[PDB]
Amino acid sequence: MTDQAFVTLTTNDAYAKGALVLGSSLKQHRTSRRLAVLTTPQVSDTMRKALEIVFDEVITVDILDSGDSAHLTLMKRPELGVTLTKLHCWSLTQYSKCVFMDADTLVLANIDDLFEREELSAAPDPGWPDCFNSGVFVYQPSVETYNQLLHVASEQGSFDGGSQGLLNTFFNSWATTDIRKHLPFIYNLSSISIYSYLPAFKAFGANAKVVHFLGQTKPWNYTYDTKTKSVRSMTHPQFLNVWWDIFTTSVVPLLQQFGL
Amino acid sequence: MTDQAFVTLTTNDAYAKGALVLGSSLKQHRTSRRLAVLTTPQVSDTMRKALEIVFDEVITVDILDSGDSAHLTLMKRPELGVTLTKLHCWSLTQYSKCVFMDADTLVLANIDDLFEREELSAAPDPGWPDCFNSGVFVYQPSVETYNQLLHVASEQGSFDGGSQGLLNTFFNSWATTDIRKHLPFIYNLSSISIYSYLPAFKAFGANAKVVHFLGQTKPWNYTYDTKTKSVRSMTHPQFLNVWWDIFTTSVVPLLQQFGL
Numbered sequence: 001m002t003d004q005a006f007v008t009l010t011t012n013d014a015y016a017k018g019a020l021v022l023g024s025s026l027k028q029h030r031t032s033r034r035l036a037v038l039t040t041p042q043v044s045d046t047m048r049k050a051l052e053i054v055f056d057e058v059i060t061v062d063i064l065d066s067g068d069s070a071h072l073t074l075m076k077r078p079e080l081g082v083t084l085t086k087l088h089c090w091s092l093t094q095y096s097k098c099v100f101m102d103a104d105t106l107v108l109a110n111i112d113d114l115f116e117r118e119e120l121s122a123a124p125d126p127g128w129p130d131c132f133n134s135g136v137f138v139y140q141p142s143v144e145t146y147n148q149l150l151h152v153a154s155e156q157g158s159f160d161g162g163s164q165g166l167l168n169t170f171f172n173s174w175a176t177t178d179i180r181k182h183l184p185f186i187y188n189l190s191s192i193s194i195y196s197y198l199p200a201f202k203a204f205g206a207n208a209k210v211v212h213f214l215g216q217t218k219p220w221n222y223t224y225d226t227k228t229k230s231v232r233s234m235t236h237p238q239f240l241n242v243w244w245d246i247f248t249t250s251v252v253p254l255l256q257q258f259g260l
Numbered sequence: 261m262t263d264q265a266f267v268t269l270t271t272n273d274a275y276a277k278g279a280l281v282l283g284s285s286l287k288q289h290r291t292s293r294r295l296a297v298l299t300t301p302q303v304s305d306t307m308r309k310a311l312e313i314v315f316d317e318v319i320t321v322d323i324l325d326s327g328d329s330a331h332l333t334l335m336k337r338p339e340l341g342v343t344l345t346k347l348h349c350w351s352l353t354q355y356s357k358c359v360f361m362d363a364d365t366l367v368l369a370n371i372d373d374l375f376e377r378e379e380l381s382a383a384p385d386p387g388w389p390d391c392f393n394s395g396v397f398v399y400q401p402s403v404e405t406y407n408q409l410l411h412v413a414s415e416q417g418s419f420d421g422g423s424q425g426l427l428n429t430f431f432n433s434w435a436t437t438d439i440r441k442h443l444p445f446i447y448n449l450s451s452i453s454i455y456s457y458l459p460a461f462k463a464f465g466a467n468a469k470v471v472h473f474l475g476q477t478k479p480w481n482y483t484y485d486t487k488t489k490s491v492r493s494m495t496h497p498q499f500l501n502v503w504w505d506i507f508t509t510s511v512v513p514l515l516q517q518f519g520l
Contacts, residue, residue, distance in 0.1 A: 124389035127457030130445040160459035185390040197387030199420035
């Protein structure tokens with residue numbers, strides 16, 4: 001309850017919108033857990049203040065500062081900045097177990113049952129199914145694990161330049177061990193798969209609990225008509241429209257409170 | 261040994277070339293099992309005769325005939341012809357366990373260790389990872405199972421119009437049960453994934469044991485230069501070239517034996 005939480009990250013204002021929609025969706029589906037968000041100094045004061053209302057805890061991380069434990073690793077592999085910032089999710093020892101969710105995900109139903117899972121439970125990644133997708137994962141905060149991950153990042157780096165490569169390298173038994181650590185695909189449904197492998201989507205898509213907006217165009221990069229309640233042209237805009245409905249209904253008016 | 265086998269299918273002459281390359285690759289990597297191939301009457305006599313040399317057993321299936329057990333189901337769902345023909349792989353009760361492989365697959369290493377698996381072990385399908393790819397699977401021939409599959413095909417059909425939809429519907433516990441039934445992706449490596457999710461391919465691709473040629477363009481649809489030993493333009497033609505090397509070296513000269 002108080003010791004468990006959903007954790008997300010925002011390094012800029014664009015992703016802060018995503019984090020705000022994600023946090024709202026979790027409240028909408030009545031989670032009994034806490035909501036935490038990692039933020040960097042590049043996130044504006046108004047976005048930070050909005051995050052303080054949606055989330056129960058807002059943690060500031062600045063890997064660009066020499067005082068950060070990941071800074072030295074950053075100097076060595078500067079392209080891993082976002083990854084190293086994300087890894088700080090393991091530093092949240094005030095929680096015994098957490099579900100990390102990228103700011104470009106959207107919750108469509110209560111997913112508190114994820115807390116029944118053990119460290120390193122994640123859904124399979126489309127494209128290369130023997131690697132798990134780093135968009136959503138169950139983990140246990142630990143300084144020791146954090147230090148071990150930073151060590152792998154320092155020595156090996158990430159085979160894909162992101163958190164996905166590093167996490168798969170470290171938690172490498174995932175593909176061949178314990179089916180329970182394979183979170184059902186509907187807990188991290190790739191937006192790409194929805195329009196790509198269509199027959200399967202028509203068959204199992206209605207059970208989607210979490211949508212992961214992948215690709216170059218993020219939800220906030222679309223134009224949304226508030227009258228027709230639909231984004232502008234994409235054979236299944238349903239999810240994009242849910243994201244925008246929450247953004248329009250709960251997030252924007254919240255940000256307006258600060259103009260006064 | 262004599263009771264176990266690799267089984268493939270060919271409904272026309274184009275796929276017969278694939279089946280011939282596949283069978284040769286299995287012999288090349290010294291399998292200790294038998295090789296069987298299901299063929300239809302539409303496969304020409306010369307291709308059939310070539311198949312009789314590569315494979316230990318050539319079984320004729322004609323679902324268009326009223327005497328076939330799947331014929332009535334075919335009349336009901338005519339678009340499932342290829343699927344129904346493929347299902348006859350379960351009718352091969354002379355074998356206690358088999359590994360079915362589509363004719364558009366290629367073996368790059370001995371995979372006899374697959375016979376350690378139990379009925380319905382298959383690799384995850386890219387696109388929708390909670391469904392297994394029907395390109396390669398471990399199964400146990402059984403009249404009862406065959407009849408049960410035909411019943412599902414009759415009543416429900418296939419959600420994707422192919423064998424993949426029907427097999428996933430019937431063997432539906434795959435995604436959530438027994439990690440051993442999840443065959444490693446390298447035992448059915450999608451050719452699409454090789455050029456699409458590149459970072460992962462560079463990291464794990466060297467361990468590929470089986471390549472599954474997907475997409476509209478099949479290996480035999482490419483132009484191959486015998487001098488440079490490479491297909492004409494595709495950032496990793498390595499596999500296409502292996503397929504063509506076997507075709508050029510073992511299959512074509514074998515087909516030439518029949519001109520005399």
